[PDB]
Design a protein around this ligand. Structure first.
Ligand SMILES: O=C1Nc2c(Cl)cccc2S(=O)(=O)N1
Ligand SMILES: O=C1Nc2c(Cl)cccc2S(=O)(=O)N1
Ligand SMILES: [Zn+2]
Length: 257
């Protein structure tokens, strides 16, 4: 099964998922000098006030905080998007060391981690239908650097002990994802894909320019999670990131000068 090890990692994924070598794969390096300001891009609208978190799951690849997406409660609109996209889950990718972990890079710089807030286009009715469409998902990507703690992350950090191993879940209600956002919503955007199998080319990527700061202790706790199930040999959940993929025939657009 695919993963992040030497014998099942990103360089192997194309054998089961040939779209891994496709025309709009993610992540990519964001070359800040080549991204063009697009004055027709609108401000992002992030409307998370009525978000209903439900559960946190270790799925063997990351941990996902899942939301009730059966109504328009937490939605992303505006920016490059047409229509309304509903928040379904968020998760992170992170490194074994503070010098790596993000999937997107900025002028080849790797951040310590990257947050993905995953939303699906309500015109397709459900997430499974949306991933079959070129405009089915919008993923809001936020970089994490190590410095001061992020207060709004701590409730996530403190439940990770209860979902150490693959397949474990825990109740995770009343979590407010607004506490994970930076001050500015300036962003880069481009068309891409899921960054794990099935690698479907269904994502409008919206990557915020401003990172959030998390503490060394917060990210150290991410690194105590396990890829393995309970009662299996312990393999720390670290370096669960895909490296940058060829940009090919795409342009990255900036919302800001
Ligand atoms: O600014 C840069 N940051 C890097 C990081 Cl964070 C990791 C690897 C390579 C680079 S880089 O040297 O290409 N230039
Ligand atoms: O690793 C990732 N896997 C995803 C899956 Cl499986 C579903 C949707 C969005 C993502 S993601 O591209 O945001 N990052
Ligand atoms: Zn992701």
């Amino acid at each position: 099964h695919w993963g992040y090890g030497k014998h099942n990692g990103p360089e192997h994924w194309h054998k089961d998922f040939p779209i891994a070598k496709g025309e709009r794969q993610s992540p990519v390096d964001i070359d800040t000098h080549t991204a063009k300001y697009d004055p027709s891009l609108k401000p992002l609208s992030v409307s998370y006030d009525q978000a209903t978190s439900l559960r946190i799951l270790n799925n063997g690849h990351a941990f996902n905080v899942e939301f009730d997406d059966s109504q328009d409660k937490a939605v992303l609109k505006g920016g490059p998007l047409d229509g309304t996209y509903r928040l379904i889950q968020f998760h992170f990718h992170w490194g074994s060391l503070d010098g790596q972990g993000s999937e997107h890079t900025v002028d080849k710089k790797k951040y310590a981690a990257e947050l993905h807030l995953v939303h699906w286009n309500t015109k397709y009715g459900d997430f499974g239908k949306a991933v079959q469409q070129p405009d089915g998902l919008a993923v809001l990507g936020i970089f994490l650097k190590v410095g001061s703690a992020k207060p709004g992350l701590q409730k996530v950090v403190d439940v990770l002990d209860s979902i150490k191993t693959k397949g474990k879940s825990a109740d995770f209600t009343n979590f407010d994802p607004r506490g994970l956002l930076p001050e500015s919503l300036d962003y880069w955007t481009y068309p891409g894909s899921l960054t794990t199998p099935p690698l479907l080319e269904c994502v409008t990527w919206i990557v915020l320019k401003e990172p959030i700061s998390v503490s060394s202790e917060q990210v150290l706790k991410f690194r105590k999670l396990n890829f393995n199930g309970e009662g299996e040999p312990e393999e720390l959940m670290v370096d669960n990131w895909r490296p940058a993929q060829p940009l090919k025939n795409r342009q990255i657009k900036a919302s800001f000068k």
